[PDB]
């Protein structure tokens, strides 16, 4: 199983016997796929284990695997277990099961129902402020994901489900779920999760203790409503707080955009005016602030799609089983289509620049009927909140800050040290 | 896992955890499905293991199953390992690596290559009656699977690749695949192959050492060409000499059936004239005897096809990934088809009343698009082989011969004892 790559003259690193190729991990799949994309060029492969991946940058086959080919040979993701009842899940589920729960969850985010958020998303922010209103008074740095996790916690359980809750789950083994796969049919027959299963009972009751839109389109289960709200509780959690983390830090260590940002805030919303949705997508600056840190901090870094039969896309024959992956990360710092890529600059998503940006290599959202269901929440829910934030306060570096800002080596798009920073009220 | 029939409302024995249904295979497939069938009527459902199994009567929902709804919902088997590289094999492939095979290997059972192959079966039949007229000069009990698989062999090897052979591989272990399918996922990375792998390396060098319409149609590979030479080779010989020994036991309990029988070979061959193609499948009393005998004893006692999406076959849910099964062996024997099912009486097959018979409930050889691809070879190489022998000997049981025959309690419609009678020369 280690020769698919040799036989189909696909470049690409040696692997191991049994780890594939897994030890290249060890500076994280960021530098990884970024030596490799160096390595090759437009297409190379390794294994994963023994499962083979097959890696491509070319705009036109990764819009044939995401976007055109995407109902008949590239619907699922790569398998992940034990999963248990999460199989269901969405981000999870495979094939017609996919369908059918893509179409039932597809109206949760129409340009109607987040118009009904903004009202209800303008307290926390207000909660946010206070929050922050504390620890600035106190000349000491600050933890930006902490108040910013506790905003978004307080955000996706009432934008679901509606709690006015006042926010003051969660390398290591799946390590071995790499070089055996053969043991996730295992794990699965002993009720493990990768989700510890005093997470999921505290939930496998809690929701039986986006809500409106399952039952009355139910058709739809039970459990597997457990399981969706999992999937949304987790991903307006962690990944809001975490890029909102990532664009205060880049904020602070560019001064010029941060005031720039906050100029163009205090120009559509005078006398620090609330944040309607019609005034959150005028704020253009806003949006290319949010753009620019996506770029350097894709936090799914990847894109992946299972094979599911013998095609020959674009002039490449692609065999059935074979893991097909775009690195985002590394297409993102691609000179050969950024300009000193390692800058942070938001003049890329200007209105004068916008357009020589292919939306095949820029894919922070991924593409396809498969992309990120909550885009456009996520985008919004962000923006209200630098606005309401931006609007009150400055972010400057303190000593302990991380400059240059490391990243993790693990499997997140997570900073080494979590983002500290002064705050200062205006 | 456990409860998806008592949701579904279809009766059943009630399954133990982890073993599911298994224990009841204490008296052998058939005996179970004849009592299953018994208990709770046209369906049912058990659990091997921890896989949930549909066991369908209909002749309607039969016919749905294996012919109407095969290259959408049921085109494959139960998953089979560990296989290794004989999950290329024909009898083991999925989906459209199968529909490819089958297209590949359909044109060598065709009217014109089984009329080539009579010249050639004609001479080991020569060797079968030699070998046959020596051990019963002696007047002694005779083993007849041995020299059946003895001449089978030679047909096999010959009417394959063709080689002049004088023939004068192979509830145990497979008892924990079922209960830990888990674990064939382990096995195939062990290179653990439930064929003793040096059976195949005995053969993954000697088939390098229907093989002409192989490479000439060679599209088709090399390691899959030996792989679906086992299954030939297997199949040609088991099978053929299994039958076989069923149809003298049952010529010899019943005598009267065996002169008639002898007396149209005679008719049709005077002078014991060598059986040609056209004489063959002129002998109706022969076909007779062939289709009761294989009434009481289909080998294959089941036929399975895994569920791959939800649907309502003839008014009845049926959710994804169950394995529907059709008892053959059941059905073969239910008074409410046959009169006095136990008894062996080839008349059911006279042209007076072979339409009396539902050919959707007398399966020996299934049906669809994946049924028995050597049907037709079978029923040749067995005819030729039962003309040339009750040309030349009568058979009569002996002292030791098991009257009545008990049937295995294993996987395979084997006897307990092997068949022994006694030969004389007319
Ligand atoms: C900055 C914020 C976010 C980013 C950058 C992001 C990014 C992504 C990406 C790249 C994918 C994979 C697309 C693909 O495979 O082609 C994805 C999938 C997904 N995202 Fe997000 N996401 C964000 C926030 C959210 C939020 C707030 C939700 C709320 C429910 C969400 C729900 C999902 C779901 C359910 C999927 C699976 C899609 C499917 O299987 O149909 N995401 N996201
Ligand atoms: C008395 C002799 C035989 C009997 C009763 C018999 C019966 C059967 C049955 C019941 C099936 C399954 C059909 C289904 O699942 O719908 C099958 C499949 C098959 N048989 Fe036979 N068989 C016999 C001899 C042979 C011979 C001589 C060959 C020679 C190659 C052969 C090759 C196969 C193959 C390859 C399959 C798999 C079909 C597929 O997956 O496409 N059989 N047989
Ligand atoms: O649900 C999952 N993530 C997407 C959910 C939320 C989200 C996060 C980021 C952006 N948008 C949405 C993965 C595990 C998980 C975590 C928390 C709750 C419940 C479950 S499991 C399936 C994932 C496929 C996948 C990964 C990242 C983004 C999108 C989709 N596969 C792997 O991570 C693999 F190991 F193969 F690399
Ligand atoms: O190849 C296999 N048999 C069919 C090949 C020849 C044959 C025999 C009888 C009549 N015709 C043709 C099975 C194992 C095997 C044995 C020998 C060589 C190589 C391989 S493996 C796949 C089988 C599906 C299956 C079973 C019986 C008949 C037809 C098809 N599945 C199971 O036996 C399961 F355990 F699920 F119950």
């Given at each position: 199983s280690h020769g698919l790559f040799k036989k189909l003259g696909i470049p690409g690193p040696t692997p191991l016997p049994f780890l594939g190729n897994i030890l290249s991990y060890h500076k994280g799949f960021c530098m990884f796929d970024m030596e490799c994309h160096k390595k090759y060029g437009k297409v190379w492969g390794?294994?994963?284990?023994?499962?083979?991946?097959?890696?491509?940058?070319?705009?036109?086959?990764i819009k044939t695997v995401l976007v055109k080919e995407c109902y008949s040979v590239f619907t699922n993701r790569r398998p992940f277990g034990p999963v248990g009842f999460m199989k269901s899940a969405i981000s999870i589920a495979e094939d017609e099961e996919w369908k059918r729960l893509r179409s039932l969850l597809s109206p949760t985010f129409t340009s109607g129902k987040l118009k009904e958020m903004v009202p209800i998303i303008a307290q926390y922010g207000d909660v946010l402020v206070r929050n922050l209103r504390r620890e600035a008074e106190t000349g000491?740095?600050?933890?930006?994901?902490?108040?910013?996790?506790?905003?978004?916690?307080?955000?996706?359980?009432?934008?679901?489900?509606?709690?006015?809750?006042?926010?003051?789950?969660?390398?290591?083994?799946?390590?071995?779920?790499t070089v055996f796969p053969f043991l996730i049919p295992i794990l699965e027959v002993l009720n493990i999760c990768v989700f510890p299963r005093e997470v999921t009972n505290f939930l496998r009751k809690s929701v039986k203790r986006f809500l409106q839109?399952?039952?009355?389109?139910?058709?739809?289960?039970?459990?597997e409503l457990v399981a969706q709200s999992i999937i949304f509780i987790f991903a307006g959690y962690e990944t809001t707080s975490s890029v909102l983390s990532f664009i205060m830090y880049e904020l602070a260590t560019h001064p010029d955009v941060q005031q720039k940002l906050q100029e163009e805030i205090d120009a559509v919303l005078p006398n620090k005016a609330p944040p309607t949705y019609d005034?959150?997508?005028?704020?253009?600056?806003?949006?290319?602030?949010?753009?620019?840190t996506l770029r350097l901090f894709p936090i799914a870094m990847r894109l992946e799609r299972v094979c599911k039969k013998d095609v020959e896309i674009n002039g490449m024959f692609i065999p059935k089983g074979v893991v097909v992956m775009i690195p985002s990360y590394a297409?993102?710092?691609?000179?050969?289509?950024?300009?000193?890529?390692?800058?942070?600059?938001?003049?890329?998503?200007?209105?004068?620049?916008?357009?020589?940006?292919?939306?095949?290599?820029?894919?922070?959202?991924?593409?396809?009927?498969?992309?990120?269901?909550?885009?456009?929440?996520?985008?919004?829910?962000?923006?209200?909140?630098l606005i309401r934030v931006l609007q009150n306060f400055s972010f400057k570096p303190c000593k302990e800050?991380?400059?240059?800002?490391?990243?993790?080596?693990?499997?997140?798009?997570?900073?080494?040290?979590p983002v500290v920073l002064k705050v200062e009220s205006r």
């Open positions: 390794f294994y994963d284990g023994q499962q083979p991946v097959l890696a491509i940058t070319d705009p036109d086959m000491k740095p600050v933890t930006l994901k902490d108040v910013f996790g506790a905003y978004s916690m307080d955000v996706i359980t009432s934008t679901s489900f509606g709690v006015n809750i006042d926010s003051l789950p969660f390398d290591p083994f799946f390590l071995s779920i839109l399952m039952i009355d389109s139910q058709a739809l289960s039970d459990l005034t959150v997508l005028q704020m253009e600056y806003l949006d290319m602030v949010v753009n620019e297409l993102h710092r691609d000179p050969k289509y950024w300009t000193e890529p390692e800058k942070f600059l938001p003049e890329r998503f200007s209105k004068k620049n916008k357009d020589n940006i292919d939306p095949y290599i820029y894919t922070p959202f991924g593409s396809g009927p498969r992309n990120c269901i909550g885009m456009r929440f996520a985008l919004m829910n962000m923006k209200l909140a800050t991380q400059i240059p800002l490391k990243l993790s080596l693990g499997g997140l798009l997570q900073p080494e040290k």
